Amino acid sequence: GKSHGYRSRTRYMFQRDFRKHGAVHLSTYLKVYKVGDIVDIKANGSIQKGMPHKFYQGKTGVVYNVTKSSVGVIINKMVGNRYLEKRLNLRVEHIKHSKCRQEFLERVKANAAKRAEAKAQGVAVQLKRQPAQPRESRIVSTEGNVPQTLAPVPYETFI
């Protein structure tokens, strides 16, 4: 018959990695999570308690509950034609903070600093990001850079 267990098809997903097996380092236990933090989920195969299901591997969610050794995380799961709210109790070995959130907060504080310093002059702050604009005019010189003519190479076996 068919087989769809709780950890089916999780072979390479829950292998550890090359040459970093063994016990886990103490930074994962010394990291501090608060309610509202945004965290990434990546399971550790060395810890069998508090494991996430294989669906939530690589998923990103929001902390809603902090307990003794675990963290409650909220994920949005697509079920059919809508998203449902899923609450997960995961031990802290299987989560880490999302770095995109802290990058955005750094942008927020630097952006507020720019607005605060330029408010003393009113110099059209222009605080929105802009994407890659087309590159403008330039003059390239041939002083020591005379062009070299290239041609297609004929065919050879090369074995």
Binding site: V140, G144, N145, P147, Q148, T149, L150, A151, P152, P154
Partner: protein
Amino acid sequence: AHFKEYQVIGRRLPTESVPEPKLFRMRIFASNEVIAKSRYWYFLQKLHKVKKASGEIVSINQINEAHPTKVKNFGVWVRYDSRSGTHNMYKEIRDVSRVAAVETLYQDMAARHRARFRSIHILKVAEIEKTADVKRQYVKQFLTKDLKFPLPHRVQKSTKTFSYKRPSTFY
């Protein structure tokens, strides 16, 4: 189409680790600027580690023929892909300009080997400055002293659907 020759000069995009790249130049026979720049990037992706996103084109210039009314003999070295492999060929064409010579070359390869524009690579084309360096008989035939020949069997196309006398093919 009716071909034109362009020089296309381009380079890599300048970085802080290396400003002023080496400004490579190539001569392309193409119908227009877009096809010329596409073929330029095609051959530079075959030669060096660069692509269009990582590089730029600094110049494109049409090179028209210096003496468009001198009759030349050109030797052309060509790669083409057949149905089973890749071959090199050397063909020589007596014609008045480089773009017309490569146009007749493309027609000749498409006619005699069923090779398409995507399969033909033009290695080089060069004017043969001296006679008796011509090595093909079909062009060495036209280099003789006081060349003259008749044109037998003249066929004159008519405008009317009916002709009122038996036509003559004297020339």
